[PDB]
Amino acid sequence: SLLEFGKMILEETGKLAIPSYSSYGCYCGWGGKGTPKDATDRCCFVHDCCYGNLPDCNPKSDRYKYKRVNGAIVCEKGTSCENRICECDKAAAICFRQNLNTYSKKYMLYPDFLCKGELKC
Numbered sequence: 331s332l333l334e335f336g337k338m339i340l341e342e343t344g345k346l347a348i349p350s351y352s353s354y355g356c357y358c359g360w361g362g363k364g365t366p367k368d369a370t371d372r373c374c375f376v377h378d379c380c381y382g383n384l385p386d387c388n389p390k391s392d393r394y395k396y397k398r399v400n401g402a403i404v405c406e407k408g409t410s411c412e413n414r415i416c417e418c419d420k421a422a423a424i425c426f427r428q429n430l431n432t433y434s435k436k437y438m439l440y441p442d443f444l445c446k447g448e449l450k451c
């Protein structure tokens with residue numbers, strides 16, 4: 331769930347989940363539409379897509395167990411859905427870190443109205 335996703339995002343990137351990634355570009359937080367702004371907005375595009383492969387669970391709400399360990403992130407014996415959600419998030423959190431440089435405060439709190447168009451997963 332978001333409570334787990336947020337801890338992850340903080341743990342890996344050092345930045346707090348909320349202002350730092352909850353409205354970034356066109357796909358972080360909101361989702362919806364548009365051509366992703368940059369590397370970090372693109373992660374969100376994949377993460378959405380990641381949650382999309384699952385219509386059988388509640389990504390935003392179902393709580394899962396994961397632990398850290400000298401660096402990497404480990405998801406644990408859950409309920410398929412629970413496990414699947416964790417790898418989705420795990421990836422996404424890794425992607426943010428992977429691209430912590432292209433992080434631009436210019437896109438932090440990027441509205442919506444300027445986000446235009448289709449994009450198939």
Ligand SMILES: CN1c2ccccc2[C@]23C[C@H]4[C@H]([C@@H]5C[C@H](O)N4[C@@H](C5)[C@H]12)[C@H]3O
Nearest residue numbers: 357359360361362363378379381382451
């Ligand atoms: C409308 N809703 C949908 C309705 C029917 C099928 C798929 C979707 C969503 C789910 C998910 C994703 C982006 C980001 C956002 O989290 N959601 C929106 C747009 C779409 C997009 O795939």
Ligand SMILES: COc1ccc(C(=O)O)cc1
Nearest residue numbers: 351352358359360374377
């Ligand atoms: C992919 O990054 C996010 C960040 C915030 C939210 C949200 O606030 O719903 C969803 C996905």
